[PDB]
Each structure stands twice: as C-alpha cells, then as structure tokens.
Amino acid sequence: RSYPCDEKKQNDSVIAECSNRRLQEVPQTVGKYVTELDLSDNFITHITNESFQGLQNLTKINLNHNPNGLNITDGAFLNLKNLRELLLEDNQLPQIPSGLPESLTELSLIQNNIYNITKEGISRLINLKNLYLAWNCYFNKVCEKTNIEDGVFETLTNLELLSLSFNSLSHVPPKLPSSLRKLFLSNTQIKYISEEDFKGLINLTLLDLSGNCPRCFNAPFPCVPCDGGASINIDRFAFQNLTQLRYLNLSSTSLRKINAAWFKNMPHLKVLDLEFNYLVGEIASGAFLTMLPRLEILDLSFNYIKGSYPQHINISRNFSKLLSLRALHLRGYVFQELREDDFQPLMQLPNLSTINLGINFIKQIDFKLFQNFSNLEIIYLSENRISPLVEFDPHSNFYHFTRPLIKPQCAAYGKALDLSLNSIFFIGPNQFENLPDIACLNLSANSNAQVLSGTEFSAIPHVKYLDLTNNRLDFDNASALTELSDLEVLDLSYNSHYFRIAGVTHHLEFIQNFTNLKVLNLSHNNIYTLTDKYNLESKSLVELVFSGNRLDILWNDDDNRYISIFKGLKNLTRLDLSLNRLKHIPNEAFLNLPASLTELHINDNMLKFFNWTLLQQFPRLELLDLRGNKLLFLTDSLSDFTSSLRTLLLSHNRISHLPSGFLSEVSSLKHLDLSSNLLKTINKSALETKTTTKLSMLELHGNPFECTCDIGDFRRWMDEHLNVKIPRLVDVICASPGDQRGKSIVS
Template sequence: MKEHWFPLSPAFQRLLFILVLLCLSLSCSGRTWAQRKLPCDVISLNQSESFDCSDRKLLQIPQDISRNATRLDLSSNRIKKLSGTSFRNLRNLTRLDLSNNFHPQKHPLTIENQTFSMLDQLKELLLDSNGLSAVPSALPSKLRFLSLKFNCIKTIRPNDFMHVRLLETIHLIGNCDYESVCNGLVIENRTFSHLTNLASLSLSNNRLIGVPQFLPQSLQQLKLKQNTITHIHQHDLSGLTSLRLLGLSGNCPVCSNTLFFCSPCNTPNGALQIHPYAFRKLSKLQELRLSGNSLDHLQSSWFENLTNLRYLYLSFNRLAGEIANGDFLSVLPGVEVMDLSYNHPGQSSYSHNLKLSRNFSNLTSLKTLHLENYVFSTLHENDLNPLYNLSHLSVLNLGTNFIYQTNLSLFGMFHNLSSLGLSENKFAFLSKKEGVLSTCGCSYGYELNRDRFGPYVHKDRLYRQHLPNIKPKCIAYGPVLDLSRNNIFHINPDMLQGLDNTACLNLSSNSIGDMFNGSEFVHFPKLKYLDLSRNKIYLHYEHAFSELTELEVLDLSHNNHYFVVAGLNHSLAFMENLSSLKVLNLSWNEISTLTHNNISSSSLQELDFQGNRLDIMWKICQNYELFRALQNLTSLDLSYNKLHRVPPEVYKHLPKTLRRLSLSKNRLKVFDWERLTQLPHLEELDLSKNKLEQVACALTSSLKFLDLRHNRISQLAPGFLRGARSLYVLDLSFNLLELINQTTFESGAENYLQQLSLQGNPLHCTCDLLDFHLWMRSNEVELPLLATEVTCDMPVERWGKSVLSYDIEECVNDENAMTFCIITSFLIILTLLVSLTAHLFYWDLSYILDYCGAKMKHHRRLVPTDFIYDAFVMYDTADPLASDWVLNHLRVELEERGERARSLCLEERDWTLGMPVMDNLSNSVRQSRKTVFVLTDGFLLRGVVKMAALLVQQRLVEEGVDSMVLLLLQPQVLQHSRILHLRRRLCRRSVLEWPADASPAAQRWFWHHLKRTIRKDQIGTHTSLHSTYFTGR
C-alpha cells in the first residue's frame, strides 16, 4: 500500500528540534552541565573533585555538590547555620574551609552538635573569622588540621580535643586580642597534653600572660606572638625538645613606634624577661623570633645550645649596644638570616657612623643581614670590617638609616654580595673628596613612616633571601643595588664606582633631573635592568644610555615633570642605540609631542606606553608612524591615552609582529574591526573599559584572547565569532547585553571558545533566552561565576537572581507544548478549510447536510393537532403580482405537490363573507399552524397587516409558540429594518427570501425550506438566551 507523508508545520518542526537537542545535551553532557550550574569552580582529578565556592554570597551549602568531592571551599560567604544534615552527602571530604562566614550584622555562624561527625575522612577544617564562642563539638576523629583564628573563643578545655588525637596543627590566633572584650584566653591545664601528634600550635594575639604548660613533646612550631607574656621561665619550654620554630615577638613592644594598641610590660626595664637557660633544651630549634620585646641585652646562654638555629629575628628592640659590642654573636655560627632592624638607641643619641661588633665575623654561615633604621649619617670602609670575611653573605639591607655619605666602592670588598639595599637614605652623590665623601654634622630628626610587611616579623619567606620592595624581575637578572627613595638629583659617574657586577639598579623615587648623554652609567657594564621611575628625567639626547650595551629592561615611568612643560623638545631616538633592549616602560609621562615621528629599535619586544597623550599626537595628524620601526615588537600597551578613536592610518603602521595590543581604559566609541587583518599575528586584544557599543564580524583567525569588559555593548551580531578559529577566551562582562540569540556563538565543531565571561550584564530572563540556555548545555565552555554573578535584570521578580534560577521547562514543556501545538494547529487548519468550503460551496453543502439529516432520521407520523390549516397566508391582494405568485405558485407547491398536501388559508378564498374583517383575521391566525407574511412594497402600510402581526404576538405570549414566518418576495423589501435583522438573529429559519436568480435548483431549495418551516414549531429554533421568554416562564 502506498504511504502518504504529511508535512509538519514549521513551529512543530522547531519544537521537535529543541526537544531532541535538549535530550541530547542532557544525556551527553549532563554531569558537566550540573557542575557548571553550581556556584563553584570544579577541578576534577582522577576520582576526586575539588569545589571552590568561596566568595559567592551563598546563604547555604549548595545541594548538588558531587559525592566524590574531597575538597570544599565555602569561605567568605554568608552562611548562617550548619546542621547535622549539612554534609550528609559529602562523606568523602578531606578538606573543608568555612572561614569568614561572619554575617554582616555580626551574627556568628551557628554550628549544631554532630555537624561534622559524619565526615569520617575529613583531615583539614578551617573555621576562621566566624564569631564562634567555643570549639565545635564532635569533630571527626581523623582530623589533622584545625584552624579557629579570629573567633571569640575565651576558654580552651581538654574535652575540646579529646576525640581528635591525630591533630597535627591547631591555629587559635586572635581569639582574645585587644579589640575583643575578653581579658585573655584561658587555656586549662593539660588541654593539649594528650595530642601526641601535635606539631604546630599558634596562639598569637590572645593576651596570654604565660607560656601554656603541659604541651606535647611532639610540638615543632609554637607561635605566641603579640600576647602579654612578660616572663619566660627556665622550665616553660624544657619539655619541647622537638621544637623547630618559636615565635615570641611583640609581647613587650617598644610602644613609641607601634601601629596598634600598646601597653608596656610591667618589668624592671619594660623588656621581656627570659631566663638564662630558658632555651637550653631546644637543641633542634631552627627559627627564633624575639622581635618587639624591648630587649636591650642578649645573653649568650640563650643561644649556646641552639646549634641548629638558622633564622634569628631581633628587630624592634633596643639592641644598639648589643650590635656594637654584643658577645652573643660568637655563639651563632650556624645562623643564616639575622634581622636587627629598628634597634635605634633613641632620638637623642643618633650615631654618626655604624658601629658593628667584631663578633659579627663569627657568623660564618650568615647569608642575609637586615640592619634597617639603625640611624647613622656616615658609612666608612672600616665600619663594615666585621662583615667582609663572611663568604656566604649575599644580602645586606641598610635601608632607612638616613645615611648621607658613603663610597659605594667599599661594598666591592664583599666576596659574595648579590643584593645591596640602600633604600630610603639621604644620598645625594654631589662631589668626591679623598675617596670618601665629605662628612656633614647632620643632627636631623626623622619620622618612621614606612609600609612594612608587618610590625615585627617578616612574614614573606622571600624576605630571607632578597631585599624588600624589589621587583622579582629585577632579582632574576642578578646582583641588585637598591638606591631608591634617596635625595639623588644628579648622576655623578664617579660616585657610582666599585659595583661593576651589578645587573639590576633601582634608582626610583629620587629627584633625578639629568639629560642623559651616555656617560652616567659607565661603571655598570653588566647592567641589564635599570629602574628610573618616579624621577624628573629629561629625554633629549640620542646617546642617552648608550653606555649600557647589555641593558634589557628600562623603566622610565612616572617621569612626566618635563614632558608637560610647553616648548621643550623630547626625543626617544636613544632606543636605536640600545641593541639589547627588550622591555621599555614609558607609562604615565603624559607624552604629547616628540621631535621624531617614529621610534626605532630592532630588539624591543615590549613597550608600555599607557598614561600618555596619544589623543593629542594623533589628533593633529602627526606621529601615525610612531611605532612602525619597532621591528620585533610583540606587546604594545596604549591604555589610558584618552583616545576617542584610533585613526585608520595608525593600524597599517603598527608592527606586523604584534601579538598583544592593549587599548583599554580609553574613551573608544568605535573600533575599526576590519583593520585587524593588518596585524596577522595578533593573539591578545584588550579593549576593556571603553565606550564601545557593538562588535563586528571581522575577528582575525589568529586572535586567542579578546577582552571587552566594561563597555556599552548591547547586542552581538549573529555569528560574529565565525572564522575566529583560535579565539579561546572572550570576556563580555559588565556590558549592556539583554539578549543572546541562537546564532551569536558557534556550536559543535565550529565552536572553539574555552572561556566566556558574561557577569554584570542586564540579561532578560525570558523565553527569548532559551537558545542561549541550549547553547550552554550543548557546548562545554567555561562560564566563570555563572551561577552567582550572571544574573537577571528583567522581569522584576527575577531581578538579581541567576540566569539558571528559572527552569526552561517554562518555555519548553514536552507534553504540554506538544499538545498545545497539535490542538492549535488542527483548529487553525480546520477553520481555514471550513471558511473556504463555505464560501465556495455554500448551497451545495447546505443541501447535502439537510438531505443527509432527513435520511438519517426515521419517518414518523405527525401527531394530529387541532389546527385546520397548516398556514395562513397574508399577502397584498391589491398587488396583481403578489396575488398571482400566491395563487399560482405558492398554493400549487404546498397543496398539490409533494408527498403530503398542506392546506392553506387564503383571504380571497377561505374568508367567510359578511363576517367582520377582524373576526376573519382572528380565526385564520388561531386555526392555522403558521402565519406566513408575503412581503412586498407597500404591503406593510395596510392596517390589517399590523393587526395580524399583533395577533401572532399575542399567540406567542399565550401559547409560547412563535407562528410567524416572513417571506420576502422582493429582495429590496425591508433592507434597513432593525426588526427584520433582529428576527434573523433570533429565528433565522423563520425568515425566507425568494431566490433572485430564479434557477430551478434554488427554487426547489426554497420550497423545501418553506415546507419544513411550516411543519416545525419555531420554539426549538430560538437560542437558549431567549427560550425562557418564548415559553412564558
């Protein structure tokens, strides 16, 4: 049998396509999509997964975290309460971070009993900054790391850690500091004694008055910084034979220069009192921190048995005398790092020169020495004699000493010095005399105003090996000389001798105003990194820096002093002579004019030109070729140049080797996307923080990273990524995108995106966003902060909620959508067919329907009635045409033809002679089943017609039967009659019209309807709205 295929409607086809795509996305990438819906970053490794949900404004723990999760970070959220069921599905967790969930209204995190009891595998638990008043109960037995820093715990009891005997690290820092209301953390006896695996205990900032007793022998790190401990007794530490690090800094601070609330210790000299043999049992100690304890004397007995000591911190004390004459230095042969900074004797007795004890020469292992803020004016060669023979000394920090005079050549006498810090002194290097600068009896005061890593101990471990505030790139090149933050305003080559091996020279933040001519740095032949930022340099001569043949990095940023002076000539021609230069920083100089139209370099790879005035240079149609001669340039930063538009001529003069171009933070309203084809190797383009409103479809195939953050882009052209086969990262965050269409991004094999950022856009979360939802499901593209920061702006009830908060089932419901589509499609098609058929085949269809209806009904005998006549015919007897039609056509058709004859009552034939007209009329109406009014022109003006109509209406009221039949013999009769129109509305079968075309078929149809109307009672043909009226009820 031949099969017939019926085409589906386009809407139905689209619905089927969406449903199939949805099913495929759910089945193929369901797990990945579920993870991306989470407000967390997920990292999968083998069978374990790590969830980073930090700083996502969460009010509760996400429910869809995988059971395989081993690490969960929930820090910096707004979680208020944790119950016993919070982690019921996360039994495989090994690390849990719940830090900083202190509510903004200062409501502490509530943790119910048994909250963590089900986490059998948990080893690390962080609960910092949560306002907790007690250690949580029922901690997991396998816990090894517990952090409770900066809470409000006032008392620690043995029962708190009774069931966590495997603990190795406990942090209880800052539970009772000076900002809290407690008087000191109370640690009951033997609280930690049963923790035989405990290796690290941090109790800093708790106002402890003594070293806790009965600590386990396994302890390797004990931190008691910034408490109120005034005495270290002989046996306080005697049981800690495994101790490697002991922190006692800040217990008796020098209150004259602290940055926090300070109360001097109530001891004879205000210093921490340490028993001569307090450290005797600590033979394994490697790091000792005694900074900020007002110590003015160091006993050799403290260090005699510390044979493994490597790091000794003694800053912020009163040890100027010990530095000059201390015997303790003779018993520290293994110390590698020593910090003696900020040990000045007092403002009234500043030293003229540096006084070092000859015992410094016994520090044979010393690698790093910090001597900041000793405060002396002159540094002579002999002052450093105790240090010259230290073959391992590589870092010497003499910063913030207000040194006015020295000869740099004396530092050349060190064997292995790689980093010399002379920052924040008073060097000027004006003139030379007898190899040592002339002395000056300066008796100036000073203020301590320096941003340090911390008030006492250097927290950064890199500080052990390097100078502070030195850029890592500078250190990587080799030996460092730091002369930043001095009073140098002129470079005298004779003053910079003796350090020929220097590879990095930092002269930033001085007042240097030289016009360099190629002679200033002749004594630095190996210099590779030169930092001259934040000075007043005037670039004029083309031979500037030409003596630095190996220079690779030159920082000239923040030297705008002369660039903003009108009328001066500025030249960058010196770059052509620097054959090794790779990086040049000219940022924040407000360069608006140059004497040369272009700058030339065959070696330069990176140019930082932000914070200048290219808008002025290019506005006057000059310097379009400024960067053309940079033959090997790969990175160009033109941000902060106040550009409204990049002239088209500029693009063709940009180096073809460019891989990175930054135009961020300008005022660009338009961008010539098609010009990117002139940069065939461009991989990274930064246009963030401009005023762009649209993105064209002209992205080059080489582009890998495109940053369009913080613009005004409101729509994306369909397929604007088509052809960008290398684009992996696209950032569209913080724009004005409201809708993302189906064709905006490519799908399947044409999609090369790996990361797409959309947070901060006013998205309209309606069904118009369905296509984007389906695209997200079917493409494994990373969308950062999708569940928390990609939010809805409209409709109002979804404002601020995630785009994932509304279910796409609202737009595509399988059963309901299909049913609705089928029904509506059927109704539309049926309506169209019926309307078209009725219009073309009205008479034929009506005849067929009536004929079929008559055949389907069984013939039944009519119930006899009391009527004498079937119909009383009222017509205009004075009209010959009307009389002829009634007598010769109507009468013949009803009485003489058909299966059953219908008797008629006619005025001219059946009325009784001599009887009043009123009586004849009344009898005819009552004795007839129907009263037929044959309407012609002028007939309605006769009074007898009106009387007959009233009698018919009276019969309707009395008997509930409507017997009136109106027969329009002429089509123009009563065309504008409201009564006739109302009659047609209420009883359309009782109004008949003689066919105008007089065709035999039409006449036969007319007689058929007339006979049926006479035979059938009219009450059944009324609408239900009027049925009660006609029945008289």
C-alpha cells in the same frame, strides 16, 4: 554545569571554588567528587549536620569570613569521616565548635572570640597536626583573658604546630606535647620564661616569643610595655633542651642584653629575629654572635636609640664569627654615614648575599666598600637620605614585610643595588666610580631632574635592568643611557614632569641605540609631544608599555606626525596602549602598529569604534584587549579578519547585540569576555557553530539579561555546549522582568 561553585582539578584533588558568591547557606549542589570546598567570604550564618550531608569525599572545608557570627551546631561536621582540614577564621565564634570530627589534622580558628581552650573542644582531636588559635584577644579589642584548661594539648600526641599568638596568656601553657615542632606565642603577655616552660620540647624547630614586653615607642598598634619598659625575663636554662631549634623570634621583647649561653644548646639555629629591641650596645660588643656559626639570617632592624643619630654604625668584630650568614637586616639602626672601616667584620663572611640597610637616614656611603664582599647579591639601601656624592594579616610576619627586597626580575640578572627613595637628584661623573659591577640598579624616587646624556652610568656599564621610575627626568639628549650597551629592561614610568610641558624639548631617540633592549616601560609619562623625531624605533624591543600617555593627542585626526610612532619597533610582540584617553584610533595609525604583535592592549580608553577589518594585517595577533571602553557594537565578520586570535577581551563596553554567526567560524578563539556589557539577550545563532571550534571560556556576568521565554535559546545553548566554561554563574543574572530580577539565569 556545576553551580554555584567553579570546579578545578589540582593534582589528587578537586577544588570547588565557591567563595565570594553572596551565598546565604551552604549549597546542596556541590559535586560528589569535590574534595576541597572553599565557601569563604559568603553570607553563611548557620552550619548543621545537614549542611554537607552525603559529601564524604570532602577532605577540606574553608568557611573563613562567614557571615560577611557563624552558628555551628554540636557535631555539625562529625559525619564527614575524611575531613582533615577545617578553616574557620573570622567567624566571630564564641567557643571552639563542639563535636568536631576526630579525623581533623588541621584546624584554624584564628580571629574569633574564643577565650577558653577546653578538653571538651579539642582533647578528642588526637590526629591534629596544626592548630591555629591566634588573634582571639589582642590590642584594645573587648575580650577576656585566655583560659587554657590544664593539659588540654596533652592528648594531642601528633601536634606539630601550635599557634596561640595575639591572645592574653600570661604564661607558657604547661603540659605541651613533645611532638611539637613550631610553637607560636607572640604578643601573649608572657613576661617571664621559666626553665620548665619548654622542658620536653626536644623536637622544637621554631619558637616565637616576639611582642612579649614590647618596645612601644612609635608603635603602629595599641602597645602595652612591661613595667618600666623592662625586657622579657628569660631563665638561664630556658632553652637548654631546644637542640633542634632553627627559628627563634625575639622581636620586640625590649631586650638590652643577650645571654650568649642561651645559644649554647642550639647548634643549628638558622634564623634569629631580634627586631624592635634596644640592642645598639649588643650590636657593638655581642658575645652571643660567637655562638651562632650556622645562622643564616639575622634581623636586627629597628633597634635605634630614640634621640640618637650617630655618625657611624658600630658593628662588633664578632659579626665575623657568623660564617654561615646569608642575610643581615639592619634597618632602622639610624646613622649618618657608612664608611669602609665600619663593615670590616662583614667582609670576611663567605656567603653574606643580602645586606639590608633600609630606613637608617644614611646621608653618605663609601660605595667602594661593596667591592670587598665574596657573594654580595642584594645591596638594599632604599629609603635613606643619600645625596649626590661629594588590619594585620594573621598569616604574615608582623614585624617586617616578606616580599623580595628587589624585584626577582631585576635581581635575576646579577648584583643588585637598590638606591630607591633617596635624594640622588643628580648623577655626577664620580657617583658610581667605586661600585662593583652592578647588573640591576634601582634609582626610583630620587627627585632626579637631570638630562641623562650617555656618560652617567659609564662606571657600571653592564646594567641589564634599570629602574628610573618616579623621578622628574628631563629627556633632552639623544645619547641618554646609551653607555649601558647591555641594557635589557628599562623602566621610565612616572617621569611626566617635563613631558607635560609643551614648550620644552623632548627626545626619545636613544631607544634605537640599544642592541639588546627587550622591555621598555614609558607608562604614566603624559607623553603628547616630541621634538624632531616623532617615532620610537628598535630592532630588539619585544614589549613596550605606553599606558598613561596621550595617544589621544599624538593621534589627533588633524596631525599626521605620530601616525608611525610604533612602526619601527620591528620585533615588538606586546604593546600596551591602555589609559591613553583614546576615543578612536585613525585607521592609518592602527595599520602602522608592528605586524609582529601577538598581544595588544587598548583597555581603559574611551573607544567608541574599533575597525575590526584591520586585524587582517596582524597575522600573529593572539590576544586583543579592548576592556573598559564604550564600544557599541561588534562585527559579524571577525572570522574573515583573523585566523590567529585566541583571546578577545571586551568586558565593560556598551555592546547590546551579539551578531548572528559572531563565533561560528572563528576557530582559533578560545576565550571571549563579554562581561559587563548591555546584552539583554543572546540568540542561538550568535554562539552556534557548524564546525569544531576552540571556544572554551565565555564570560557573560554583569549583563542586564531579559529573562522572558526569549532567554530559553541561550539557556538551551549553555546545556548543549558544556565544554564552554562560563564562570561566575551566580553573576549571570536576570535584570528583568520583576519576578526574575536578581536570580541567576541557570535558575
């Protein structure tokens, strides 16, 4: 079996996953058919022409974050004739390594100490397509200004992407190759853009000039503005040859005025980022908006005027000219109320599907305005002040998060409205009156402490996914949420406020009324007592998440009231009982779990005992997760209790003995995780079979193995059953005797 890497086929490639393994040097045991070697996050200090000798099939090597700087000799990689991608990020490299192979098409030197880009380093790398040199000198790091040798990129006639962001450049480098498609120059101290800087870049599709003359008020990083907080100075004809431009990033360039003619020669500009500028005036007038008919994304976030909290947002009539617009981001403009008249220019846009108004301190909204859009799909109003109606990831965006605004699982149902992190503490009878038909509603974190009673959502009765997490909801009415006839997903996580009070009444009977409820999450509610109806019932429910409650109290051996709590969930296939402080489950309570279960999690409890015999009543159980408990032993007759179990997770328990014949006849078991237990040895008889079984993954890392001659049988078993993958062999370590301690058992 391969050691120390884990090999995986990925289409026309074989990846040797060898990261985060405490490797002091590159292993001389890499498979000859391995094409991509990931050695990131190890303690490798030196690379020589011997490091990867003979490994001619390598097309990619990742040495990022080594040593967790990296010493690379001249020509160390030269003999690898098929090497195309070399990642050397976060290696404290003082220079571009010398004698790199001419076959390289991608070279990443992000987050190093390289302040000189020389012809000796890269002129010979004529096949380079992508070159990343970002984040070598920035913020208050002690570093030198970047010297770019004149014409250093000129011979790179196939270069398509060049990134020099987060380096002190002062000027755009001259003599850039005309093959460039993407040029990143963010946070480079380039205060002036001349008409010659991008002269020959006729195939450019992306230009990033963000963070040059930055807007520094309240910056979450060391920020140095241009003299007098002045804007980036762009010559009138700087972009005249950028006819193929699709992406233009001018975020944090302290822009107050936008010359509409800068877009005259950009007939296909698609995404324009103007976040962190001073464009409230331009948003209200904006002649440049008339020069962007094929723009799809416009980001004008955080353009607020410090000290100004106006009553309304002032959107120019010229926003109506953005006929291709699909997403408009207007976070941090800052205004008190959003009225129908204020968004009239956006209502004629036929494909505007996302509107992001997060972080504007909005207090009130005429919700009826959202009925007058053609294809509005995401209405993102999270993090405002709406009340009841009367360190830096170099591979991500620096000015905004890139995750979906609304969870794709919620947004997939239809029109999505996100009102999370607001103050809609009480939903009165007219709160949702003039809203369009909403399918996905997020009301998380609104300080809502009301008793929902079946009428609050009557104006939007087709909500399919409702997120009410992180409120103080008082479940005190059996008719709660029943007006949502089509509800499929309901998230009530983190509403423990009233559940934790014994003396108040608690009612969860409403769950039974839903004909189409599939997923219900009651996590972290501290549920320990219910009033009158002790059971959850539903003919439709498929998944119930009950983690972070108190089944230790509900199933106390002196109380029989909750022994059938989940029995009525007749269609349930997934059940999560993690984090319920369970020391034991009464046998009658385990037997009352739905017989339809396919996946049962009881991880992260304090289980001292598990009655394996009871698996005879779960003929469809495929996954049993008992990780993070205090189980002391395993049954020797699992094969007699189940013919369906496929995955059994027992990591982080106190099992010190694997019984003889444990797996001999459990044919269905594919994955067994016994990692982080107290196994000192494994006898041959515990893993051997006399029949063909489906075991293909066995985890044993973190056990305190005794590496005397008594471990030989387990080692011989590993050699004789190569189809059973054992991951993390570097962590399947000897705890004793002293001479073997720390060494991997495979040696």
